[PDB]
Design an enzyme around this catalytic site. Structure first.
Site, PDB file in Angstrom:
ATOM      1  N   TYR A 886       0.499  -1.270  -0.035  1.00  0.00           N
ATOM      2  CA  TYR A 886       0.012  -0.148   0.029  1.00  0.00           C
ATOM      3  C   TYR A 886       0.911   1.139  -0.110  1.00  0.00           C
ATOM      4  CZ  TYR A 886      -3.897   3.352   1.186  1.00  0.00           C
ATOM      5  OH  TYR A 886      -4.764   4.302   1.133  1.00  0.00           O
ATOM      6  N   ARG A 921      -6.414  -2.061   0.684  1.00  0.00           N
ATOM      7  CA  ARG A 921      -7.294  -1.531   1.656  1.00  0.00           C
ATOM      8  C   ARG A 921      -8.898  -2.300   1.205  1.00  0.00           C
ATOM      9  NH1 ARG A 921      -3.616   0.087   4.135  1.00  0.00           N
ATOM     10  NH2 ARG A 921      -4.190  -1.981   5.097  1.00  0.00           N
ATOM     11  N   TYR A1002       2.379  -2.499  10.531  1.00  0.00           N
ATOM     12  CA  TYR A1002       1.304  -2.297  11.499  1.00  0.00           C
ATOM     13  C   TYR A1002       1.605  -3.084  12.473  1.00  0.00           C
ATOM     14  CZ  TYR A1002      -3.456  -2.548  13.233  1.00  0.00           C
ATOM     15  OH  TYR A1002      -4.715  -2.341  13.894  1.00  0.00           O
TER      16      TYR A1002
HETATM   17  N1  LIG Z   1      -5.897  -5.810   2.215  1.00  0.00           N
HETATM   18  C1  LIG Z   1      -6.890  -6.211   2.789  1.00  0.00           C
HETATM   19  O1  LIG Z   1      -7.856  -6.677   2.549  1.00  0.00           O
HETATM   20  C2  LIG Z   1      -6.596  -6.322   4.263  1.00  0.00           C
HETATM   21  C3  LIG Z   1      -7.704  -6.776   5.090  1.00  0.00           C
HETATM   22  C4  LIG Z   1      -7.300  -7.059   6.570  1.00  0.00           C
HETATM   23  C5  LIG Z   1      -6.129  -6.425   7.009  1.00  0.00           C
HETATM   24  N2  LIG Z   1      -5.323  -6.166   6.417  1.00  0.00           N
HETATM   25  C6  LIG Z   1      -3.799  -5.697   6.860  1.00  0.00           C
HETATM   26  O2  LIG Z   1      -3.174  -5.141   5.555  1.00  0.00           O
HETATM   27  C7  LIG Z   1      -1.473  -5.310   6.022  1.00  0.00           C
HETATM   28  C8  LIG Z   1      -0.769  -5.486   4.923  1.00  0.00           C
HETATM   29  O3  LIG Z   1       0.472  -5.433   5.380  1.00  0.00           O
HETATM   30  P1  LIG Z   1       1.695  -4.813   4.723  1.00  0.00           P
HETATM   31  O4  LIG Z   1       3.163  -5.334   4.889  1.00  0.00           O
HETATM   32  O5  LIG Z   1       1.374  -4.776   3.193  1.00  0.00           O
HETATM   33  O6  LIG Z   1       1.516  -3.201   4.979  1.00  0.00           O
HETATM   34  P2  LIG Z   1       2.275  -2.453   6.203  1.00  0.00           P
HETATM   35  O7  LIG Z   1       3.314  -3.117   6.909  1.00  0.00           O
HETATM   36  O8  LIG Z   1       1.363  -1.811   7.156  1.00  0.00           O
HETATM   37  O9  LIG Z   1       3.329  -1.159   5.282  1.00  0.00           O
HETATM   38  C9  LIG Z   1       4.085  -1.620   4.643  1.00  0.00           C
HETATM   39  C10 LIG Z   1       5.359  -0.450   4.744  1.00  0.00           C
HETATM   40  O10 LIG Z   1       5.440   0.645   3.661  1.00  0.00           O
HETATM   41  C11 LIG Z   1       6.000   1.667   4.188  1.00  0.00           C
HETATM   42  N3  LIG Z   1       5.504   2.728   3.520  1.00  0.00           N
HETATM   43  C12 LIG Z   1       4.201   3.204   3.750  1.00  0.00           C
HETATM   44  N4  LIG Z   1       3.907   4.313   3.075  1.00  0.00           N
HETATM   45  C13 LIG Z   1       4.746   4.420   2.099  1.00  0.00           C
HETATM   46  C14 LIG Z   1       5.263   5.403   1.268  1.00  0.00           C
HETATM   47  N5  LIG Z   1       4.425   6.471   1.032  1.00  0.00           N
HETATM   48  N6  LIG Z   1       6.286   5.196   0.601  1.00  0.00           N
HETATM   49  C15 LIG Z   1       7.208   4.344   1.013  1.00  0.00           C
HETATM   50  N7  LIG Z   1       6.948   3.438   1.912  1.00  0.00           N
HETATM   51  C16 LIG Z   1       5.862   3.747   2.503  1.00  0.00           C
HETATM   52  C17 LIG Z   1       5.815   1.612   5.657  1.00  0.00           C
HETATM   53  O11 LIG Z   1       7.238   1.594   6.341  1.00  0.00           O
HETATM   54  P3  LIG Z   1       7.967   2.935   6.703  1.00  0.00           P
HETATM   55  O12 LIG Z   1       6.962   3.895   7.073  1.00  0.00           O
HETATM   56  O13 LIG Z   1       8.797   2.578   8.035  1.00  0.00           O
HETATM   57  O14 LIG Z   1       8.802   3.474   5.726  1.00  0.00           O
HETATM   58  C18 LIG Z   1       5.113   0.367   5.950  1.00  0.00           C
HETATM   59  O15 LIG Z   1       5.727  -0.251   7.301  1.00  0.00           O
HETATM   60  C19 LIG Z   1      -1.783  -6.718   6.704  1.00  0.00           C
HETATM   61  O16 LIG Z   1      -0.632  -6.698   7.798  1.00  0.00           O
HETATM   62  C20 LIG Z   1      -3.140  -6.743   7.541  1.00  0.00           C
HETATM   63  O17 LIG Z   1      -3.110  -6.344   8.869  1.00  0.00           O
HETATM   64  C21 LIG Z   1      -5.534  -5.999   4.834  1.00  0.00           C
END
Ligand SMILES: NC(=O)c1ccc[n+]([C@@H]2O[C@H](COP(=O)([O-])OP(=O)(O)OC[C@H]3O[C@@H](n4cnc5c(N)ncnc54)[C@H](OP(=O)(O)O)[C@@H]3O)[C@@H](O)[C@H]2O)c1
Ligand SMILES: CCCCCCCCCCCCCCCCCC(=O)OC[C@H](COP(=O)([O-])OCC[N+](C)(C)C)OC(=O)CCCCCCCCCCCCCCCCC
Ligand SMILES: CCCCCCCCCCCCCCCCCC(=O)OC[C@H](COP(=O)([O-])OCC[N+](C)(C)C)OC(=O)CCCCCCCCCCCCCCCCC
Ligand SMILES: CCCCCCCCCCCCCCCCCC(=O)OC[C@H](COP(=O)([O-])OCC[N+](C)(C)C)OC(=O)CCCCCCCCCCCCCCCCC
Ligand SMILES: CCCCCCCCCCCCCCCCCC(=O)OC[C@H](COP(=O)([O-])OCC[N+](C)(C)C)OC(=O)CCCCCCCCCCCCCCCCC
Ligand SMILES: CCCCCCCCCCCCCCCCCC(=O)OC[C@H](COP(=O)([O-])OCC[N+](C)(C)C)OC(=O)CCCCCCCCCCCCCCCCC
Ligand SMILES: CCCCCCCCCCCCCCCCCC(=O)OC[C@H](COP(=O)([O-])OCC[N+](C)(C)C)OC(=O)CCCCCCCCCCCCCCCCC
Ligand SMILES: NC(=O)c1ccc[n+]([C@@H]2O[C@H](COP(=O)([O-])OP(=O)(O)OC[C@H]3O[C@@H](n4cnc5c(N)ncnc54)[C@H](O)[C@@H]3O)[C@@H](O)[C@H]2O)c1
Ligand SMILES: CCCCCCCCCCCC
Ligand SMILES: CCCCCCCCCCCC
Lengths: 1038, 90
Positions: A886, A921, A1002
């Site tokens: 995201y 999202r 998160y």
């Molecule tokens: N998609 C769905 O349907 C759904 C449903 C339920 C739950 N979820 C949640 O979605 C999460 C997805 O995990 P994820 O690993 O993809 O997400 P994440 O760990 O929340 O975010 C990924 C990393 O990207 C970096 N980032 C954020 N904005 C940025 C920007 N503009 N430019 C560069 N880097 C940026 C951040 O690190 P830094 O800020 O430290 O640089 C952040 O830690 C799951 O863990 C779950 O809890 C999703």
């Protein structure tokens, strides 16, 4: 002051070798570019690399200086390939040509050369030994004996052929079957496994053998045949080596080798024990029994030999069976030997002083095993003349203590194996007997036949909706969401049949019906425009021209086929409901191929138009009331068309959260309205209780859906704070609300009054709205996409509560079709993480595979790079996998990423995308954002389809993802995400992770792949760094 | 599979080859002089029925290789594909 002498005042030296037929050189020019990058001055003897085929022009172009022979050994560093000896050209020993406080880097072998150590101690020098580096984990980049063993194994294979006069491969041509050659490898160390690989890849079959128990597993992994002996005693050699076995084991092994020696063709022996001779494993009569023309290679001819017939250095024929017994085998591949030995010396001198413009390497004997002081004291055999060769023991012993934690699937195995076969069958029979007695309970409570028919079509439409939404492509989950929001606008069907009077409403029920029709037309028009806008972004520009207007041909004869019968005296409404339900099934069934996806929008439009036409013509409205109906639907449709066109696609979850509330509210506005329009008929009806049960349940479901989707919109938009606001006692409050909502149906029955019924309806609507606000505001802004899908199921079942109530088949078919879609999407999303719905909604710590507490710590430091090394390391690659998250789309970085992927695919690379199922999202959001960026859908792959392609991948770009690539989900059972399926990006060659700063996501407080040696960090915002990579690929290639 | 920028039919009467035009040989030697500075081993098996083997590598085209390359000529009996090949020795 820093306690070393700087790099500028020192000088390394590369002499030539006066030893007989010696060819490899100490430093290749790639190792002369380095150490001038580090800071030394390099001087090279004139004739030094001609035998290793390195001209002096490369040493001059690497920064060195070609000089003589006496003033090369008189340097601060002297770098040889073997020990100094008598020089018959100069008539003086080479140790007398060294300077006073020099430094020598050589194979010394101090246990075998005491006079060399005497002559070096008389010159008061410091001597490091490439021999005596211990075989540990951090010192395997500089292990000269392993390099020479690898080269000796490959050279023994390529010398076996060119003296063996048959093929190794063996083909079936149309001229005769030729069998493959059979090669036996005694002893798999480094040379044995190198020989097994070089002989197996060339075509022969290998049947090697070793006494250790791990080397047989390495043989089986390489593809050979591990041999076994009957006398089964232990493989000795503490420290991971081999001792001298017993005499009975040797005379059993020679029996095995004599049985195997009559049928193999090439025998490569590599048996060698430390501190002793090589064991004699083959007699004269054992080796004269081979086939004539065989090749027998002896790799242990320096330290004795494994044969009773080996002249160490000759190739005498000896009645056919040719013996190869060379003692300097890496010298015949001197280019490869010189390059690998130069890499070993360069990586030694880079490691023993990891400092700029100083050169220290403290030699101390505190002896932490595994650390580098072990390597320093074990390597140095002489310091300032005083010999220190017997190195004392390391204090502790790690690296050989089995304390290894199991992986998370191995802990899941004892849960999957502790369930007895009786209890599986017992709980399965319990589930089926509960379902059958629930069917009997619905049978007893039936007031009439229409309820039984409607339960039948409800169950069948539920199974149809179950099968048809597992079939959809996982790249089209958000157009599925949009299609179900468009078809859920058929609550206008429930509004039109309660809408009466004239051009204006007369009573209050007729105004509630007008409100319901209005907001449902908003749902219809908005959902179909956002579906058609999202499905036109998957259209590749190289696709053939499609003609969608041809699907006006069925619509024009379906509803046009209706009215011509309606102007005939026929009544086709119960069959038009079936046709509309089948068209809405085909709307979701066609959205499963990506080639039929535009059919899956047109059939839904035909189904909604046929349903509205059937309910509009089965009422026969007067021309002023039909004008009110058309005005309400036109104003709602106009608002829906003007909302569904101005939005961006990244604001698409909010709009989806904005739709279910308009499906919830209308549901409430139907049910209360049918309590008003059919209140004076509860005296003379037998079904008077069913139409109150279903009204109460529909009001509850709509009231939960409305308020929960409103809080979901407020928390996705940014109005409410995205933190899970927790009330002090929230489970007691929720249980009290649910107890009041369930127990309020008891005053709603047992009393035929109107004021009591309408106050129970208002109370259950208010309590359902309060319960929706209370349950939704305790979730958290990241698992908010659960609330999008769960309420998506509720906006389905409210339709069923609107179909049971109005005795309408089309509403129940559509409601089952939408409820199953929402339930299966929320299942996919709860199983894509490792949480349950009670874990997400009620609030729980972590995951249903975590255990106990104290997650394991972090180890090491992170490698960090800049734009130039990252772009050079992109250019070296030939297969790139990008894992977006995201953070790529919140920074609007998908457009330069799409242009970068287009540029790299214009140059023959293999650049694909890997999508995690909960990255975004909304379900399937990231596929649609990459489609809007311009990426073709065939290079975008799901997690399951790309997961086994990571080890064969040159480069992985992780852009804005932390939890979906986290290795602690597979190897730490105490983690907060333990058991979650993640993109295993660490199994590739190189990983670049782009993010702002080293922090958290998160959850999962620290990511262990960031502190891993095959991962380089590239800090910065994603938009700027992706624009920089685009500009560098553009300005370097065009 | 390599390619040259001249479209001439290489086949003759049947499955065997035929003699090429002088411009095609010059373009093929341009290709071979271009990719002779990048390869490490080269094996020439060219053999035209009816007459001797075509010369495809000059004596200055083959000396531009790296110091240590191996050049194997399987047409050393019927002429050779090099103007520097002793037809029976290393
Ligand atoms: N998609 C769905 O349907 C759904 C449903 C339920 C739950 N979820 C949640 O979605 C999460 C997805 O995990 P994820 O690993 O993809 O997400 P994440 O760990 O929340 O975010 C990924 C990393 O990207 C970096 N980032 C954020 N904005 C940025 C920007 N503009 N430019 C560069 N880097 C940026 C951040 O690190 P830094 O800020 O430290 O640089 C952040 O830690 C799951 O863990 C779950 O809890 C999703
Ligand atoms: C109101 C009345 C509703 C009547 C519903 C009848 C149908 C429900 C049971 C059959 C469908 C589910 C099924 O196959 O479950 C078996 C399976 C058995 O699993 P399994 O281990 O045999 O795995 C093979 C079967 N599949 C792959 C299909 C799962 O168990 C579950 O799915 C567990 C959850 C069941 C949830 C429903 C409970 C019964 C319905 C209670 C209604 C209210 C009283
Ligand atoms: C009056 C009210 C009556 C209500 C009746 C509710 C019945 C619910 C029990 C059936 C659950 C599904 C069958 C069991 C199963 O396989 O579960 C695992 C399944 C997952 O299946 P799975 O992954 O175990 O099986 C493999 C499936 N493939 C290969 C496709 C991946 O769980 C779900 O699908 C979650 C949603 C459950 C179903 C939602 C409703 C659709 C059907 C409604 C019928 C009644 C209307
Ligand atoms: C365009 C909509 C009108 C099409 C004309 C044919 C339909 C018709 O018979 O309408 C008269 C009908 C009245 O039916 P009717 O009583 O005239 O039935 C025909 C009987 N004969 C042939 C003897 C005259 O009007 C309606 O049904 C009003 C609602 C129209 C719904 C239109 C749905 C699409 C928009
Ligand atoms: C009377 C004459 C009736 C002739 C047929 C009328 C069709 C009307 C429009 C239907 C559109 C939807 C079709 C559909 O569901 O296709 C899904 C599928 C095609 O898509 P699919 O199922 O292959 O999609 C792939 C999905 N997986 C991988 C899960 C399988 O077609 C069927 O299921 C066909 C089954 C027979 C349907 C026959 C029509 C309905 C039943 C008869 C009704 C009248 C009596
Ligand atoms: C015209 C001959 C007589 C036919 C009369 C039949 C009765 C009316 C049926 C209307 C429903 C649609 C018919 C089936 C699909 C036709 C093909 C098609 O749309 O292809 C996409 C075609 C072509 O799409 P495209 O991929 O070329 O993209 C271009 C998109 N536009 C045109 C917007 C720039 O697009 C459209 O027709 C417009 C966009 C889709 C519709 C958006 C608004 C939807 C409103 C709700 C839907 C209707 C619900 C029922 C309400 C009553 C309607 C009268
Ligand atoms: C007016 C008419 C009203 C009619 C209302 C009808 C309501 C019908 C409800 C249908 C949904 C039934 C859900 C059953 C889920 C079973 C899943 C399962 O097997 O879990 C074990 C699994 C165990 O994990 P697993 O990975 O082993 O999965 C099982 C896989 N097999 C079977 C192959 C072994 O649990 C999970 O995966 C964790 C998540 C479970 C829950 C996920 C969401 C479920 C769907 C909820 C959607 C919202 C429901 C709305 C209800 C509305 C009521 C009014
Ligand atoms: N990164 C690492 O883990 C790493 C790196 C380098 C080396 N090593 C270890 O060092 C060793 C490498 O082997 P090497 O070739 O350098 O040593 P080596 O030259 O001593 O190998 C001789 C081989 O012959 C075998 N052998 C001894 N007596 C035998 C007998 N009677 N019959 C049959 N086979 C017999 C030994 O087991 C050994 O495999 C292995 O133990 C390996 O685990 C490990
Ligand atoms: C859960 C499905 C319905 C269960 C109904 C039980 C029996 C109700 C009887 C009502 C009076 C006839
Ligand atoms: C006392 C009679 C009760 C009749 C209704 C029982 C519950 C039926 C629910 C069917 C699904 C909404």
């Amino acid at each position: 002051v820093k306690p070393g002498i700087p790099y500028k005042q020192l000088t390394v030296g590369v002499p030539k070798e006066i030893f007989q037929n010696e060819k490899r050189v100490a430093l290749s020019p790639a190792g002369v570019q380095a150490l001038v990058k580090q800071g030394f001055n390099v001087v090279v003897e004139s004739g030094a690399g001609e035998a290793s085929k390195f001209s002096d022009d490369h040493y001059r172009a690497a920064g060195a200086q070609i000089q003589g022979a006496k003033e090369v050994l008189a340097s601060d560093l002297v770098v040889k390939v073997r020990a100094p000896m008598l020089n018959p050209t100069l008539g003086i020993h080479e140790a007398d040509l060294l300077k006073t406080s020099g430094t020598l880097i050589s194979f010394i072998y101090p246990a075998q050369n005491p006079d060399l150590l005497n002559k070096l101690s008389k010159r008061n020098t410091t001597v490091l030994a490439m021999d005596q580096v211990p075989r540990v984990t951090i010192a395997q980049g500089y292990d000269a004996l392993s390099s020479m063993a690898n080269i000796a194994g490959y050279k023994a294979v390529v010398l076996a052929a060119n003296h063996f006069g048959r093929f190794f491969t063996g083909q079936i041509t149309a001229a005769g079957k030729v069998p493959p050659a059979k090669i036996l490898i005694v002893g798999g160390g480094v040379a044995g496994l190198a020989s097994a690989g070089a002989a197996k890849s060339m075509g022969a079959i290998v049947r090697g053998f070793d006494t250790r128990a791990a080397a047989l597993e390495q043989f089986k992994s390489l593809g050979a045949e591990p041999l076994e002996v009957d006398l089964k005693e232990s493989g000795e050699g503490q420290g991971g080596y081999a001792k001298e076995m017993s005499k009975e084991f040797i005379e059993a092994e020679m029996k095995l080798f004599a049985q195997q020696c009559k049928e193999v063709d090439i025998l490569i022996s590599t048996a060698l024990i430390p501190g002793k001779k090589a064991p004699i494993l083959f007699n004269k009569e054992m080796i004269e029994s081979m086939k004539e023309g065989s090749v027998v290679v002896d790799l242990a001819a320096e330290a004795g030999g494994n044969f009773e017939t080996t002249k160490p250095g000759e190739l005498y024929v000896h009645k056919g069976i040719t013996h190869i017994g060379y003692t300097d085998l890496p010298s015949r591949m001197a280019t490869q030997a010189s390059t690998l030995y130069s890499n070993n010396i360069t990586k030694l001198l880079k490691a023993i002083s990891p400092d700029k413009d100083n050169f220290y390497f403290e030699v101390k004997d505190d002896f932490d095993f595994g650390t580098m002081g072990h390597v320093i004291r074990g390597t140095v055999v002489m310091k300032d003349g005083q010999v220190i060769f017997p190195a004392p023991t390391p204090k502790n012993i790690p690296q050989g203590a089995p304390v290894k934690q199991k992986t998370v699937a191995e802990l899941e195995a004892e849960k999957a194996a502790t369930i007895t076969p009786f209890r599986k069958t017992m709980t399965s029979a319990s589930v089926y007997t509960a379902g059958l007695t629930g069917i009997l309970g619905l049978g007893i409570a039936a007031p009439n036949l229409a309820f039984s028919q409607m339960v039948t079509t409800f169950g069948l439409a539920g199974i149809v909706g179950y099968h048809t939404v597992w079939g959809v492509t996982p790249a089209l989950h958000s157009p599925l969401m949009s299609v179900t929001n468009a078809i859920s606008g058929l609550t206008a069907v429930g509004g039109l049949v309660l809408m009466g009077g004239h051009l204006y409403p007369s009573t209050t029920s007729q105004g509630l019906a007008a409100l319901a029709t209005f907001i449902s037309s908003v749902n219809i028009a908005g959902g179909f425009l956002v579906t058609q806008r999202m499905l036109d972004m998957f259209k590749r520009p190289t696709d053939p021209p499609e003609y969608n207007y041809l699907y006006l041909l069925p619509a024009g004869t379906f509803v046009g086929g209706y009215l011509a019968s309606l102007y005939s005296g026929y009544n086709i409404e119960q069959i038009m409901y079936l046709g509309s339900g089948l068209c809405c099934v085909g709307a979701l069934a066609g959205l499963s191929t990506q080639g039929t996806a535009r059919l899956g929008n047109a059939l839904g439009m035909i189904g909604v138009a046929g349903g509205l036409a059937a309910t509009l013509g089965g009422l026969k409205p007067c021309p002023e009331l039909l004008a009110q109906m058309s005005g309400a639907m036109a104003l709602g449709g106009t608002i829906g068309l003007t909302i569904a066109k101005r939005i961006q696609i990244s604001d698409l979850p909010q709009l989806v959260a904005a739709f279910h509330s308009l499906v919830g509210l209308a549901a409430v506005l139907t049910c209360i309205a049918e309590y008003i329009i059919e209140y004076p008929h509860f005296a003379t009806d037998a079904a008077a209780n069913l139409t109150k049960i279903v009204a109460y349940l529909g009001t509850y479901i709509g009231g939960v859906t409305f308020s929960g989707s409103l809080v979901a919109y407020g928390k996705l938009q940014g109005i409410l704070k995205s933190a899970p606001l927790l009330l002090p006692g929230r489970h007691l409050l929720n249980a009290g609300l649910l107890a009041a909502s369930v127990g309020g149906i008891i005053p709603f029955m047992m009393d035929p009054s109107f004021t009591t019924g309408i106050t129970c309806l208002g109370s259950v609507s208010a309590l359902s709205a309060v319960m929706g606000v209370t349950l939704t505001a305790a979730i958290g802004g990241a698992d908010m996409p659960v609330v999008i899908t769960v309420l998506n199921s509720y906006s389905g079942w409210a339709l069923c509560a609107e179909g049971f109530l109005l005795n309408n088949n089309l509403l129940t078919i559509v409601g089952a079709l939408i409820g199953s879609s929402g339930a299966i999407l929320s299942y996919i999303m709860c199983v894509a993480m490792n949480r349950s719905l009670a874990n997400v909604i009620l609030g729980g710590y972590g995951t249903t595979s975590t255990a106990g507490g104290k997650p394991m710590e972090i180890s090491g430091t992170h490698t960090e790079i800049n734009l130039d090394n990252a772009i050079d390391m992109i250019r070296e690659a030939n297969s790139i996998i990008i894992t977006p998250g995201y953070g790529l789309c919140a920074a609007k970085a998908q457009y330069p990423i799409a242009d970068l992927v287009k540029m790299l695919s214009e140059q023959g690379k293999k650049v694909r995308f890997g999508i995690h199922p909960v990255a975004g999202r909304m379900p399937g959001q990231l596929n649609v954002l990459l489609a809007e960026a311009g990426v073709p859908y065939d290079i975008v792959l799901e997690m399951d389809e790309i997961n086994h392609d990571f080890p064969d991948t040159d480069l992985v770009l992780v852009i804005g993802a932390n939890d979906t690539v986290n290795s602690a989900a597979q190897e730490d059972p105490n983690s907060i995400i333990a058991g979650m399926p993640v993109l295993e990006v660490w199994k590739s060659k190189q990983v670049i992770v782009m993010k702002r700063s080293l922090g958290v996501g998160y959850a999962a407080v620290d990511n262990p792949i960031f502190y891993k040696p095959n991962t380089a960090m590239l800090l910065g915002d994603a938009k700027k760094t992706c624009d920089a990579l685009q500009a560098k690929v553009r300005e370097s290639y065009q």
